[PDB]
Amino acid sequence: QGLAKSVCKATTEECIGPKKKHLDYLVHCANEPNVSIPHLANLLIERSQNANWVVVYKSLITTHHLMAYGNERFMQYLASSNSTFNLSSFLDKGTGGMGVPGGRMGYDMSPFIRRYAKYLNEKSLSYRAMAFDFCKVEGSLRSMNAEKLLKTLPVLQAQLDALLEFDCQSNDLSNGVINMSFMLLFRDLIRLFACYNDGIINLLEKYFDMNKKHARDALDLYKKFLVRMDRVGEFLKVAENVGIDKGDIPDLTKAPSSLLDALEQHLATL
């Protein structure tokens, strides 16, 4: 199978992000009904077990790319057959070429590899719980019904929380590998942010017609949402400073407290 060779070409030790050509080939393969998704996943998982942080991170970036740009086949597998990454203890302190030193790159990249892998596994978990990819919304948060909304927001929120745990500073984004991952995280965040907002507008529309327990659930979810928009604001700030088009940066607006005041008063009278 051309797979193996292709997975290796996209996950080479060269310290730059996987090349568009290879990512495009793998996406082609991933959408083909006669190709073994399990096999392709195992090949990537195998590379994610490498000792070299560059190979690992690129394997994670390739998986993210397949998850966001190929059809669901690849994604459905990881979520169902629960095929996760196991990098919760990844650590690269052991730095060939022309004898070029890697310095403390492996060490400083390690936390990001961990957080990124964790977000990708959380992306799988989220799809396993919903049967669909929030970053592609079939399954409108805006129109969804109260009960469905309340079981959906906790899942969307957990996926967004895992993404924000990336928590990098501008000085951290210092090579082509981590830069590419941050770009892919940014694209997911924008989509996630939009779904979250839709879900919350919907929550507020149905809030006043909710019973007693559901009213309390919704109020909590709403407060959590407020905390998270500040976090998204900080993420976007960093996105702005590292060179991402301000035209692709959503213009957030502080939420009105009078509104939160209303939700609480209504809750009591209930």
Statement to judge: residues 98 and 188 lie in one domain: no
| Integer Cα distance of 87 and 115 in angstroms | 9
Statement to judge: residues 55 and 151 lie in one domain: no
Q: In whole angstroms, how large is the CA radius of gyration of the chain?
A: 20
| Integer Cα distance of 186 and 192 in angstroms | 10
Domain-located, residue 220: yes
Token duo for residue 172: 């951290």
Statement to judge: residues 147 and 105 lie in one domain: no
CA distances from 222 to 92, 142, 189 (A): 40, 15, 19
Statement to judge: residues 178 and 212 lie in one domain: yes
Domain-located, residue 184: yes
Statement to judge: residues 112 and 156 lie in one domain: no
Secondary structure of the chain in HEC code, one letter for each residue: CHHHHHHHHHCCCCCCCCCHHHHHHHHHHHHCCCCCHHHHHHHHHHHHCCCCHHHHHHHHHHHHHHHHHCCHHHHHHHHHCCCCCCCCCCCCCCCCCCCCCCCCHHHHHHHHHHHHHHHHHHHHHHHHHHCCCHHHCCCCCCCCCHHHHHHHHHHHHHHHHHHHCCCCCHHHCCCHHHHHHHHHHHHHHHHHHHHHHHHHHHHHHHHCCCCCHHHHHHHHHHHHHHHHHHHHHHHHHHHHHCCCCHHHCCCCCCCCHHHHHHHHHHHHCC
Residues 6 or more apart whose Cβ sits within 8 Å of residue 138: 132
CB 149 within 8 A of CB 203: yes
What is the separation of C-alpha 261 from the centre of its chain, rounded to a whole number of angstroms?
33
CATH of the domain at 153: 1.20.58.150
Domain-located, residue 197: yes
Which residue in the block uniquely carries the two structure tokens 């990249």? Answer: 109
Which residue in the block uniquely carries the two structure tokens 């966001």? Answer: 68
Which of 118, 150, 178 is the last residue before a domain boundary?
A: 118
Q: How many domains does the chain have?
A: 2
CATH of the domain at 68: 1.25.40.90
Domain that holds residue 198: 136-252
Technique of determination: X-ray
